[PDB]
Amino acid sequence: ELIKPNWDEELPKLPTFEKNFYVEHESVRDRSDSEIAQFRKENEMTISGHDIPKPITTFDEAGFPDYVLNEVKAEGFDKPTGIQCQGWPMALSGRDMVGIAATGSGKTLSYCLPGIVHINAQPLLAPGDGPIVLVLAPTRELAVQIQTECSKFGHSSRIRNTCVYGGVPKSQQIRDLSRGSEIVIATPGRLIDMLEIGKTNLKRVTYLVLDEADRMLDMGFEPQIRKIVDQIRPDRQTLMWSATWPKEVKQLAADYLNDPIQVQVGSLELSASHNITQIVEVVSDFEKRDRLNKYLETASQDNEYKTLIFASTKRMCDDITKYLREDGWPALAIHGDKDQRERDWVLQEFRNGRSPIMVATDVAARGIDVKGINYVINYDMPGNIEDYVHRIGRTGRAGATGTAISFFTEQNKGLGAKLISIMREANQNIPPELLKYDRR
């Protein structure tokens, strides 16, 4: 079962790997130190640690070999993600890292591409051997996300992966751990039920990634995790990602890392309460009024519904309500352009049922508590994401259920990426062709 070796007696008998692969093109050093400090805090990165690499700013600037540099731009993307631009240099250079970013961030390429480079510097699997890079994820869905990126970027080489997670045939995973995987992704539960049968082993693990560490401990995989990391040689490179910062994540990082850099990209992320169902639809500005009515009537048969509509201009809450009451919707517009005299009986006739549907702007969305709002509808997609979550937050907290409908178009491109990271935080269904903003 357990037994936890002494890493002074078995360690100097173990072979020894190299884990630095970064060239640090002189394009990046120097730029410097007013614009890499401007770049760093424009992605709201907050780094700390010793000897922290300057971020790259294009694919060529990351010291990637070509069999993966070619396939990383072949995705048709310019100027790789912020998390990729500070993460790839420290990962390729073999340091350990604790990264703070929201659940759903563009984190998995951060460490899978340097992992691929980490493998093809090392002897082959030499039958009897187990994985080189080991990734631990809480959920099956993230584990398969990760393996999609590991076979996409691994195909160029022999790199073979097999993720072992729970709720699937436990002998077609004995048959996949049988067959020399260089990458093994595992929920910690099933990794321990394959390590007592001894169908796999971690004594060639040199590169460890704990993804979504915080919600790995939430579901109490901490016992499991702690007794898989003991089994791994302590001169490994170790990368750990977390959205929150509990006392135990703080200690998990303390126990199982070694001189790590601390990168925080996110903003200590916010609830987007899970009582709300979220409906996004990729549409044009043109056909958008058409789909207003479809959902307006889907909500407008249940009494007493109360919908809240948002649009970008305040001029386009008049044209939206002049349209909406012209075929008999009890719709009133709220905004500061006119008459704040008669702006606050729209709400004395909103929390009763006199006019269930009220249309307003983000600037107009100012400190009013009319909660009871059902089926809130973003006609015009906002420019930041801290407003989207402030928009949709007014439904379903007492009556802890509600719906949110968003009309997403191409003039929200820069918000596509961040928006998906708010849905997988809340384990919500994602439109099949909103997903094309997933990373970068």
Residue numbers in the entry: 57 to 496
Lines quoted from the article behind this entry:
Human DDX5 and its yeast ortholog Dbp2 are ATP-dependent RNA helicases that play a key role in normal cell processes, cancer development, and viral infection. Similar to other DEAD-box proteins, DDX5/Dbp2 is composed of two RecA-like domains that include 11 conserved motifs. The helicase core of Dbp2 consists of two RecA-like domains (RecA1: aa 101–319; RecA2: aa 332–465), an NTE (aa 53–100), a CTE (aa 466–496), and a linker (aa 320–331). Here, we report the first X-ray crystal structures of the Dbp2 helicase core alone and in complex with ADP at 3.22 Å and 3.05 Å resolutions, respectively.
The Dbp2 catalytic core apo (Dbp2-apo) crystallized in space group C121 with 2.5 molecules in the asymmetric unit: two molecules (aa 57–496) in nearly identical conformation (rmsd 1.11 Å) and a half molecule (aa 57–326). This molecule fragment composed of NTE-RecA1 is likely generated by the limited proteolysis of the linker between the RecA1 and RecA2 domains. In the crystal structure of Dbp2-apo, two RecA-like domains adopted an open state, with the NTE subdomain located on the exterior surface of RecA1 and the CTE subdomain inserted between two RecA-like domains. To estimate the position and intrinsic mobility of the two RecA-like domains, we calculated the distance between the centers of mass of the RecA1 and RecA2. This distance was 42.9 Å in the open state, showing that the two domains were far apart, as shown in Figure 2B. In the Dbp2-apo structure, the RecA1 and RecA2 domains are restrained by the linker and CTE subdomains. The RecA1, RecA2, NTE, CTE subdomains, and linker form an interaction network, stabilizing the conformation. In the structure of Dbp2-apo, the CTE consists of an α-helix and a disordered loop that inserts into the cleft of the helicase core. Residues R495 and R496 of the CTE form five hydrogen bonds with V128, E131, and T137 of the Q motif in the RecA1 domain (black box). We solved the first crystal structure of Dbp2 to date, illustrating that the protein is rigid and in an open state. In contrast, the CTE has two conformations: one in which Dbp2-apo is wedged between the helicase core and one in which the addition of ADP induces it to move out of the way of the ATP binding site.
